[PDB]
Design a protein around this ligand. Sequence first.
Ligand SMILES: CC(C)CCC[C@@H](C)[C@H]1CC[C@H]2[C@@H]3CC=C4C[C@@H](O)CC[C@]4(C)[C@H]3CC[C@]12C
Lengths: 263, 6
Amino acid sequence: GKETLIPVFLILFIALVGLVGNGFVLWLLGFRMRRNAFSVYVLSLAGADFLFLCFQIINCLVYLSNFFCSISINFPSFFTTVMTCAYLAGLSMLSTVSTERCLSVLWPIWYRCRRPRHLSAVVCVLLWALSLLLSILEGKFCGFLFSDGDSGWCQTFDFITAAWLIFLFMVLCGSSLALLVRILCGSRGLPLTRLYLTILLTVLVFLLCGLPFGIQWFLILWIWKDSDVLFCHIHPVSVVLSSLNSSANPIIYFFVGSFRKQW
Amino acid sequence: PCKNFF
Ligand SMILES: CC(C)CCC[C@@H](C)[C@H]1CC[C@H]2[C@@H]3CC=C4C[C@@H](O)CC[C@]4(C)[C@H]3CC[C@]12C
């Protein structure tokens, strides 16, 4: 009732801020600005964040509508799976950005010369395809499509997305660690302080705001089986942190990188 | 469905 309403206003505000940020990033990198090999990843991450933030706006707006106006807007059940696809694709883009930075620092000669030009596009397409495959197959077995599926085979396939999520986190932490070792061992001209500050900032953002929604939604919910406690308190906060993470992602990745020279 | 829903 009232205890859920106060997080939901935070959801709509943070979602609107991240919405206008992701829209600006999408428009700029699509049309106005020249694209690097790396800019494709930021564009894809903004696109993956868009769907998730728009669906958060929908899911809070109809909660306002149901609470005050009581219209009882029942939804199509396949919104959840495309929202899950958006979330997983955003996290995959985060980890792939980290690995691309590590590959650039470790092998500079290969990254300048021998790197294929469409490698960023093919990696983005493959990770989006794998995210969509893990999303709809979690959707069909758990009832978030036309047909309904068994809950017993739901948890077998849902834990696969959780294991993939933990692997996707360990890839981000492992690759950001190797870059730090390389720049702290024998790198001369780089700005070290700003560099480890921004790397550590991305690591804490991805661990504290990106992970908890997925962890709680998939792996945590099934194992705990403490329904009264979990939904009322844990769930509202989990969405907000994950929603917050999507909003802060354009600011961290594109706007700090691009608009630094302007201010 | 099978899931709690949000
Ligand atoms: C196989 C299917 C699921 C992929 C389609 C995913 C859709 C939703 C969209 C979201 C953002 C899109 C990407 C946005 C940016 C570019 C850069 C462009 O130079 C190559 C295409 C590419 C990489 C697009 C590929 C398709 C894409 C990833």
